[PDB]
Write a protein that binds this DNA or RNA. Sequence first.
DNA 1: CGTTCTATCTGTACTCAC
DNA 2: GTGAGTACA
DNA 3: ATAGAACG
Length: 175
Amino acid sequence: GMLTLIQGKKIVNHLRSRLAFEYNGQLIKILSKNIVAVGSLRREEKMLNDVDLLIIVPEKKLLKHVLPNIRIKGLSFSVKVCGERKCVLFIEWEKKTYQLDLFTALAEEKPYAIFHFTGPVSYLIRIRAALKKKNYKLNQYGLFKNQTLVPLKITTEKELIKELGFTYRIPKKRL
DNA sequence: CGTTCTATCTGTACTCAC
DNA sequence: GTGAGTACA
DNA sequence: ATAGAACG
Ligand SMILES: Nc1nc2c(ncn2[C@H]2C[C@H](O)[C@@H](COP(=O)(O)OP(=O)(O)OP(=O)(O)O)O2)c(=O)[nH]1
Ligand SMILES: [Mn+2]
Ligand SMILES: [Mn+2]
């Protein structure tokens, strides 16, 4: 069911202090600095088809556990699909049902994953096609050339975009 | 030779063979 | 266990 | 962003 930008932000704000995962007995809280709003919400589209959240996980050992044992305090939801990297929930928010999409990235993948999950799709396609012509492959995990991770000296998304030789635009204006 | 239109990526989760 | 086909991020 | 194709 479709939702407004404002509704999207209220939901994300509510989830931001309430996400956790079960890890061998212990309930472990997910920190706010590891929750990044992505998709059309980040791009500030007036109407959203869903809410898209990227979760930064500190260790590779945790991937088996975070999404598959995801917990949301005081909220009822069902699980449509769930793996280590993509989880789709249907959540009850103020008597209505909405789609929440959760994705995981490792610290070293962060800027690549924010770039990828921010979209929009058409932007990603043209950017990736251009890199492909110069014999590179870009995905949510990194920049690859001949199946080898290229070690870029970069922390943020903005640094990545510039490093790739493309114009930086705020998410609202990417196309 | 300029204008305008067109096309283009990459990977995850689930199901169902065999 | 692996590969193909679908749906969808 | 880039480059090819149709059109002028
Ligand atoms: N490379 C790539 N990335 C995608 C694709 N589909 C989705 N994504 C990424 C970029 C999107 O902004 C992000 C979320 O996808 P959604 O389908 O939720 O679309 P988005 O939120 O942009 O709009 P919407 O949900 O319809 O309001 O995931 C795809 O086909 N290819
Ligand atoms: Mn979305
Ligand atoms: Mn989504």
